[PDB]
Symmetry: C3
Subunit: 149 residues, 3 copies
């Protein structure tokens, strides 16, 4: 009995695990996730960078990062407004790095940006036409999280 009951329960658990994964797939699909493409999502709430990082981390994601023009366009279409990107030069001025580590491989700065304006701007937002502008991390912009392809 015992061993049989246990084996049966292990079978149910694995079935439930598959069932949850299906739920996750269907959710992503319904939200527009494209096949083999990163899933970007927003609640359309504007908050300071620290909060954005906190929120995405809590959802086990990361602040959205465009690796190329294709992803930059996808992020733009999702936010529909100015949104923080997972890129900052907080650690070392002038040297932008992804919040997940690494230096920039792709950028789409606006005319005369980055300018580290005034007191200093260490964060980055994707604005009009998907162009970038560095801004104060304390400002409040749309939170856009990223999930695996």
């Amino acid at each position: 009995a015992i061993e049989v009951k246990l084996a049966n329960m292990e079978a149910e658990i694995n079935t439930l695990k598959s069932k949850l994964e299906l739920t996750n797939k269907l959710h992503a699909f319904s939200m527009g996730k494209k096949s083999g493409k990163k899933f970007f999502v927003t609640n359309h709430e504007r908050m300071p960078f620290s909060k954005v990082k906190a929120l995405c981390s809590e959802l086990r994601g990361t602040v959205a990062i465009p690796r190329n023009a294709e992803e930059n366009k996808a992020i733009q279409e999702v936010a529909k407004t100015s949104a923080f990107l997972g890129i900052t030069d907080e650690v070392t001025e002038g040297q932008f790095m992804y919040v997940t580590g690494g230096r920039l491989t792709y950028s789409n700065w606006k005319k005369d940006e980055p300018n580290d304006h005034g007191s200093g701007e260490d964060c980055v937002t994707i604005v009009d036409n998907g162009l970038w502008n560095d801004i104060s991390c304390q400002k409040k912009k749309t939170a856009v999280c990223e999930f695996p392809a």
Copy 2:
């Protein structure tokens, strides 16, 4: 070993409960839930009050209740049309109460409403402009449920 397998099962169940809660958190977020705010959802189906209340209940929610102007605006935007609110005066005519308890505090009544028109109107709907009107609970309005903050 039976105990090793049992210990693994506890870990599997725990891992699963955590993943399921993450799936719930991501869904809410993707549905527009703002941090520390209750969120509203609708399938855009029109139905009499009894069915909205029942439906929201089986989803572990409640028929939408605007506790203030911000929330009133949030419900209006989600609903897009006339929707039932979780407010009625079925228990004592003239005394509006929340479906979950308590006397109505914040209100956004239209001019000359509530009027318990004709044979009577005990339910409440939020109309296109966000104002409220009391109506028959048998009328079919959009089903909007709210889930805790």
Copy 3:
């Protein structure tokens, strides 16, 4: 302990099954699923017919099939642009069948369609106006999956 823990685990698994069921109901509702009606979902990605079939099967759904004018309109609203239907005449040229088997019980063919134009057209797409046109299965159309009522 062993038998007590084993019994509790059974209770834990059943509780999780109920929770996931609920998560599934809430998601369907959030996506506009109406009571007693099938629901169609799309990520708005264009792909060849074989890919749509593969994707819907992976979501445990089927490629969208309109059984009447109501569902035909429903699918059209969801897709927003030309999408594949789960109908093809791949088995026997001229004999359109559901991907789920059987002859069509309802059709909305545009004038002089289906015509197996040129090199051949064995798949079907619901155009922007709801009418049907048979087209090449290799063309990229919007993926719309169907789930039961």
